[PDB]
Design a protein around this ligand. Structure first.
Ligand SMILES: Cc1cc2nc3c(=O)[nH]c(=O)nc-3n(C[C@H](O)[C@H](O)[C@H](O)COP(=O)(O)O)c2cc1C
Ligand SMILES: Cc1cc2nc3c(=O)[nH]c(=O)nc-3n(C[C@H](O)[C@H](O)[C@H](O)COP(=O)(O)O)c2cc1C
Ligand SMILES: O=C(O)c1[nH]c(=O)[nH]c(=O)c1CCc1ccc2ccccc2c1
Ligand SMILES: O=C(O)c1[nH]c(=O)[nH]c(=O)c1CCc1ccc2ccccc2c1
Lengths: 313, 313
């Protein structure tokens, strides 16, 4: 009994991977993720130039989850490309490279250079749409006409199947609009739902203070706080994008949580906060737990139950 | 040491009240909230005509919060107007009446008839801007032009101070835009942040099923899930609306949670999910708990710490 699966012309030992941004910034991190029992890894979202990111403290975690305003600290695209091209051992597991340029031009520039490496090595692109937009405007994925432009320009520039990392939505009409944008692009083969729930605020009662320094304490939420949000987005896009895969991310701490993601429609299941907190050993626990729940239910495959969440009447 | 507040030309023994929708639909419910130690009460969001609401099950609760798609079940405006005009004992505490017309014209018709009762008895209006509007459009407060229309029309028709109940926002550009719309309306004297976090999905692993029947299991989230999101919204509007009060709602289960709201900027503190779960006895507990935190810190009044959350450097 094993959890192996095939997606996107790659084979995976199991559906688990890190979430972008967690345990994936440096060569050390990527080698640690590659040594883990995860089925795949994704690199830290990158920009063309290296970034220091925001002042510390910029991440904090608590029993119910985490908050962050990292500010896209990363080693720069040339580093992640070199890692994909020369350093990653593809015999161990697939690699996803995450890009988050500050403009459409920057994304085009990076994807033109990634294309030949994707062809030669099979690295997979995850395009992070929680990225900077023009004056007055919300993040790109919350501006559907900007989103359409990014995807048009990246599709043309890259020319190969890729995925998109989405922020959560909270309104059925937004689900409908966003999925219709995505379904305009045949090269968008997977949608990862969700990025952190934007601009929450954690306050420490004793100190009477916010707990992260940037943005007056406001930052993206992950962990237990966000699991029903994440399940809703996974299922909403699973229903709306039948020709695409959905990757679930948000609130996974156990095999049971992974089970719920898969029942909602998830093909791969990403682990952010709980991975940051527990470390890469989590992957063996999650695999064991998921297999245990499958066994108790009589499921032998993921495909027996993926997307098969039941509704009432 | 005391929890008293004076605002909106009323006096409140303490800042706690029910959140709209919870323990406020029937005369029995309203009498119960009136008999409780809460500092105020709000009636169930109403429509002109009575509504049965959505099929059951339509509310469920769990350790980390609740999900609902109640569908605005209510006894109709005339009932809530009568309660305000003839039944409520204003010597016990103040009363808010929440309205949630399905169109701007339905809201105008109701506010026109509320006005004289507001003027004579002092009932306070809370306009719910999570009213669905046209299906396939976002809820009203996620459509800034609709929101502006609603506020213009209601301000003209009512002519008296009122407040608004807001959904959470997740993007700084939305906080900026939403507050700016509200700040166009001088009669909007309070802003209640937040309504439920929209379209979450809870899935029960044993049964492999969603837990509520409407909308394929999608519904609004409350409780522990939503506290950092609620805090963020309270503080975002507190900072952006210096001539308005903010009332906090979301995730309050303890005096400490209430303290965090109030440090964020809350004047009144509303209690939804935890009240639904625990019953009106929660109000004595919350008061005691908040007074205990005040005593430890040496705070004698709420205003000593309201809005006084610290940021880092
Ligand atoms: C410290 C940190 C850094 C992150 N950086 C990124 C990033 O570079 N790119 C990205 O797509 N998402 C990023 N995220 C979002 C996560 O990939 C994930 O979507 C989010 O944390 C929700 O999953 P979780 O509940 O498992 O934490 C980051 C999250 C954290 C906590
Ligand atoms: C069962 C139920 C009914 C609700 N009905 C309404 C309503 O009629 N009007 C409204 O403004 N908010 C309504 N809400 C939202 C609550 O007022 C509140 O904003 C939300 O539950 C978050 O607070 P909490 O975390 O304390 O539950 C309802 C919530 C619940 C759980
Ligand atoms: O690095 C982050 O703060 C981060 N945290 C998340 O929870 N999700 C993300 O997607 C990101 C990075 C998003 C991002 C993407 C591009 C950015 C560009 C300039 C400044 C900040 C930028 C931030
Ligand atoms: O009555 C509700 O379902 C409700 N629940 C909340 O968590 N907050 C709200 O503001 C409301 C009332 C607004 C509302 C919310 C959902 C609805 C679904 C179908 C039909 C009408 C609806 C009206």
């Amino acid at each position: 009994m094993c959890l192996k699966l095939n997606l996107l012309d790659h084979v995976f030992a199991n559906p688990f991977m890190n979430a972008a941004g967690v345990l994936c910034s440096t060569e050390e991190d990527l080698r640690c993720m590659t040594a883990s029992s995860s089925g795949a890894l994704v690199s830290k979202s990158c920009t063309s130039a290296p970034r220091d990111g925001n002042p510390e403290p910029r991440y904090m975690a608590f029993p119910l989850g985490s908050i962050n305003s990292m500010g896209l600290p990363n080693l720069g695209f040339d580093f992640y490309l070199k890692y994909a091209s020369d350093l990653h051992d593809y015999s161990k597991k697939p690699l996803f490279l995450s890009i988050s340029g500050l403009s459409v031009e920057e994304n085009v520039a990076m994807v033109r250079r990634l294309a030949p490496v994707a062809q030669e090595k099979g690295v997979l692109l995850e395009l992070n749409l929680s990225c900077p937009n023009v004056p007055g405007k919300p993040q790109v994925a919350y501006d559907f006409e900007a989103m359409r432009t990014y995807l048009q320009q990246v599709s043309l520039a890259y020319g190969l199947p890729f995925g998109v990392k989405m922020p959560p939505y909270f309104d059925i009409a937004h689900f409908d609009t966003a999925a219709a944008v995505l379904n305009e692009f045949p090269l968008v083969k997977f949608v990862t739902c969700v990025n952190s729930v934007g601009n929450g605020l954690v306050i420490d009662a004793e100190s009477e203070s916010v707990v992260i320094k940037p943005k007056q304490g406001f930052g993206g939420l992950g962990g237990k706080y966000i699991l029903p949000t994440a399940l809703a987005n996974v299922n909403a896009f699973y229903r709306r994008c039948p020709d695409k895969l959905v990757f679930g991310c948000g609130g996974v701490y156990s095999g049971e949580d992974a089970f719920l993601h898969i029942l909602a429609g998830a093909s791969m299941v990403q682990v952010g906060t709980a991975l940051q907190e527990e470390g890469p050993g989590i992957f063996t626990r999650l695999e064991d737990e998921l297999l245990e729940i499958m066994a108790r239910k009589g499921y032998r495959t993921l495909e027996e139950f993926r997307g098969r969440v039941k509704t009432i009447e």
